Chain A
């Protein structure tokens, strides 16, 4: 008894597989995990080093990029071109390097109560004024005041590395 809403980031209509509420493999309800570029970079590299450690058992941008590239080749198999482009893109477009900086950013933005998608954009796109954020992220409209967004953006730039 089943037969035949277009996806739109601005309206927070992310589709069917990326709904706000998710069910993990344990059956426990969980909140959709959306990662900013800095958070995603840490997650990918942390998994790669752990994978490298398992296999063995059985900083400026240039040096980090080379270190990531060598690690990627060692701990990945064939058809890894997509991941190579991703790590290069992530390293050259992130805003927070260390885990402590990322942790502070998550703590800061978790008090806003916005959608997981919107908070990920905030930590992924650099903005100067609330007007720029509002036009770049339409979902923020009628959800957060300009004064609240202005202080958040200023604080976000405070913790930006270098």
Chain B
């Protein structure tokens, strides 16, 4: 038994975790459960956006984070740095930028740190940002040449990608991200009103179809007159 109010899910607001929230949500046997001594839902602890990341990088300058779009190859210094934006291509699980000279073009790999820094410089503000949790049981320091670090980072990225009638009621009786199916919904902070049959079926609540398209209230005006 729980003392909290019993409610129904009226909206599902998809979004994306912030690094702060993942650390805040995390409780760490801590995932009888050592955290609640219970009924236990499961306590958290602490690849699909590569195309989106590439598009964002092409659509914005990669030095000042100011909107330029993909075809543009110059910052158009309006506030700007004037650097010529590279042509970004997706190779494996990495992004490679190429600069054309003013004679093969210069090429280098845009480090994930560089991409993150630029994204943080870019001007949903609450639920899903471009810059942006271990499932619970129920579900460089020294030396390290650049080659070794790059190989380790590639292996870690590859591993991450791979990892990712019993009642009288029934007796008598006898367009939303969730409805379509989710990554896109989280990126755009899509709000699902849960007005469709699919959403209610997923959440296990009475659907607004047939006997559920209305509400049965209780009237006291008739009750007093019935005695």
Give complex CA distance A3, B126 in Å: 8
A143 contacts the other chain (CB 8 A): no
Give CA–CA (A1, B128) in the complex, Å: 11
B26 to chain A, nearest CB (A): 16
Q: Which of B93-147 contact A (CB under 8 A)?
A: 126-127
Nearest Cβ on chain A to B17's Cβ, whole angstroms = 12
Report A-chain residues with C-beta under 8 Å of the C-beta of B126: 1, 3
Q: Nearest-CB distance from B188 to chain A (Å)?
A: 14
Minimum C-beta distance from B225 to chain A (A) = 20
Least CB distance, B18 to chain A, in whole angstroms: 10
Please count how many residues in chain A sit with their CB below 8 Å of the partner chain's CB atoms.
2
How many A-B contacts at CB < 8 Å in the complex?
Answer: 4
User: Shortest distance in angstroms between B47's beta carbon and chain A's nearest beta carbon?
Assistant: 26
CB-CB nearest in chain B for A1 = B126
Q: How far is the CB of A79 from chain B (nearest CB, A)?
A: 15
* Minimum CB distance partner of B24 in chain A: A4
Contact digits for A1-20, partner B, Cβ 8 Å, 1 yes 0 no: 10100000000000000000
B97 CB, nearest partner CB in chain A, Å: 35
Q: How far is the CA of A115 from the CA of B126 in the complex (A)?
A: 36
A window 142-159: CB within 8 A of B = none
- Please report the C-alpha to C-alpha distance between residue A1 and residue B127 in the assembled complex, in whole angstroms: 8
Q: Which residue of chain A has its CB nearest to the CB of B20?
A: A4
Least CB separation from B125: chain A residue: A1
Give every chain A residue within 8 A of B127 (Cβ-Cβ). Answer: 1, 3
Within 8 A of A (CB), among B22-59: none
Residues 92-116 of chain A: 1 if any B CB is under 8 Å from the residue's CB, otherwise 0? 0000000000000000000000000
Say how far B19's CB is from chain A's closest CB, in angstroms.
15
User: B191: nearest residue on chain A (CB-CB)?
Assistant: A1
Measured CA separation A3–B127 after assembly (Å)? 9
Per-position contact with B for A117-150: 1 when CB-CB < 8 Å, else 0? 0000000000000000000000000000000000
Residues of B within 8 A of A3 (CB): 126-127
Q: Which B residues touch A1, using CB under 8 A?
A: 126-127
Shortest B189–chain A CB gap in Å is: 9
Q: In the complex, A79→B126 CA distance in Å?
A: 45
Closest approach, in angstroms, between the C-beta of A40 and any C-beta of chain B? 27
Interface residues of A in 1-55 (CB under 8 A from B): 1, 3
A70 to B162, CA, bound (A): 74
Q: How far is the CB of A1 from chain B (nearest CB, A)?
A: 6
- Cα–Cα, bound, A3→B17 (Å): 12
Write the nearest CB–CB distance from A2 to chain B, whole angstroms. 8
Chain A, Cβ-Cβ closest to B13: A1
Q: Which residue of B lies closest to A2 (CB)?
A: B126
Whose C-beta in chain B lies nearest to the C-beta of A3? B126
A89–B65 alpha-carbon span in the complex (Å): 65
Instruction: Report A54-95 CB contacts with B as 1/0, cut-off 8 Å.
Output: 000000000000000000000000000000000000000000
Shortest CB distance B36–A (Å): 21
Interchain CA distance A128-B127 in the complex, whole Å:
55
B 178-211 binary contact with A (CB < 8 Å = 1; else 0):
0000000000000000000000000000000000
- Inter-chain CA distance A33–B127, complex, in Å, is 38
A interface, CB within 8 angstroms of B: 1, 3
4 A-B pairs in the complex with CB atoms less than 8 angstroms apart:
A1-B126, A1-B127, A3-B126, A3-B127
Which 4 residue pairs across A and B have the least CB separation, nearest first? A1-B126, A3-B126, A1-B127, A3-B127
